[model samples]
Target: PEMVRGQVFDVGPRYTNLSYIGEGAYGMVCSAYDNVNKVRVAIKKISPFEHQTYCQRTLREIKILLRFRHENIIGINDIIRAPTIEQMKDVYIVQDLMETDLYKLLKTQHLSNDHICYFLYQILRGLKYIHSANVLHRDLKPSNLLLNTTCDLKICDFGLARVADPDHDHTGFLTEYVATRWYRAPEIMLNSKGYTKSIDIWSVGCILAEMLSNRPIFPGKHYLDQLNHILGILGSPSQEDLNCIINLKARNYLLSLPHKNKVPWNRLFPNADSKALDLLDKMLTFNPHKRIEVEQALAHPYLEQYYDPSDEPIAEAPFKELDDLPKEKLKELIFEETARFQPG
Candidate 1:
């Protein structure tokens, strides 16, 4: 039987006021308190009836979350069912509440070198865990990474994850849309059908670069434009790399593009440490096959010396009691008040 925990009502003082954390195509996250433990948790409520695709994704996310347990990955505390008839079919996932995502923190210009290293290390650790479990987090951007009180990081949102069977040849012929555009791997960007776990590693490299530079390394407006942006910075694709690209349906689009290359390590991150820059190069290599593995990345001098294993532990945050708020009031606020804010 599935692990059964007490209902949400049994957990805490109900707080009618729930601050919106963020929103995506599938759902939105709200900050709520766990009355029983006196801790805060992020409640991600999804309206499954709104879209079949999103509903399927939510189910997949729940399955993946329940199976994967790692310090660097987000922890799911409980799963709540919506109350009303309309919402009865909806599913809500309760998670350890986070202060915000890494993107917002980075935007505030509060990241230190130590903090960046800590966050990246945790992300790498999380990726390693997922890969070891034979899964791939195809979507890994700053927004998907949540931060707690100590600025410690955890990877969340397994909606785009896929299980990989190492022994079999899973490579196919059509373009498989997976990761976010800017953080996508070169092979995926080129529309390769037979991609591998290296795709997520590439995104990790983009994320590391973004954290250091305090801006997206390649913010492509469209598919073709994104390719141009990557090529502009990393240079033209080599013959060997292009062979992998030919596997894609959009191979012609790449062939017509001009050779645009930028300076190596020094130019990309002039102020960055040589050791760190070296690792970034290996992670962001144009050839997916040449991309560094998670174990190798963790062992890299940039990570080994700078990252602190103990520092990644969960830290405490100010949690409101959920039971204190009357259920009727919360229903009013979430439904009535929030209803007015909705635009036609």
Candidate 2:
């Protein structure tokens, strides 16, 4: 290891003396200059061995990110690992550096119909690639959607299985904590059985609505508040929605709320284009199965036949992990992941 001048000191053979990017969920992020590729990149340094839960999350993120390759998805450009099993102290995933994320961009300016359509098109295209990869992004927020100055966008922070290791799953219930609370789908709130990728579509609808209004449509402070906000705008869910909820208490909780009629799109997003609003309405359907699928969304008049139907998802290999696997078990996995995630 060379002297890095970082808090962690020198740790890599190629990337050196990188500047801090931010404090990620598991570790510090930095922007490193790649010697071989001759490009600036963002590196996620994960020292999961410091905690059991962090290890799984780091590994899960790394494993899934390694397999991704698409125009709209942030591809992993490189990886760094510790020398041996005992010293598996820091693991890194390197990806292209973007000017800012969608959250950051929205603050500076407003998006127009042209901006909205292109942005949504790319978002769905990324989803089409990722959904076919046998993994669920689960979390889709403004911050997670990265952006570049060229009006390009890429989805990031996917990297997990919706269901954690079943053996380690203490509560023995369907996973409810996936997407951000405000954009979280209705089925997740009610704890519906076998909630699928449609949950993500619901979030996209919220994002599309956000782009139009320049603010969150259903900005709930908590789950109950979120539900209240959603029902208030979109009206109440039907009897079929209630029957799908596996959790009795959650189902009963929704039933207790009085019916609220949906506000028309013209009132909700007065400035939005009619076609854009129609597509947004379809994405926000209360029923998961009935919600506009990615293909349908790409076909909507808003996208204007630019999206190709032949671009089906790839049957990518899924990421795997052990429940609290020791560094002994991690040594090979970490090194192998580094070697294979060569976007160079």
Distance from true position, residue 86, model 1, in Å? 11
Count clashing residue pairs per candidate. 10, 1
Q: Could you tell me the lDDT of residue 116 within candidate 1?
A: 72
Error of 2 at 176 (Å): 5.7
| Among all candidates shown, the one with the greatest lDDT | 2
lDDT of 1 by residue, 180-202 (tens): 78987766545453236787888
Which pairs of residues have clashing backbones in candidate 1? Answer: 11-36, 12-35, 12-323, 13-321, 13-322, 13-323, 13-324, 14-322, 14-323, 14-324
Reference-based lDDT, residue 322, model 2: 61
lDDT, residue 87, candidate 1: 50
Candidates' lDDT values, in order?
0.68, 0.74
Write down the RMSD of candidate 2 (Cα, Å). Answer: 3.6
Which residues of candidate 1, in runs, are more than 4 Å off?
1-17, 82-87, 165-178, 193-195, 248-252, 306-344
Clashing pairs in 2: 4-10
How many clashes show up in model 1? 10
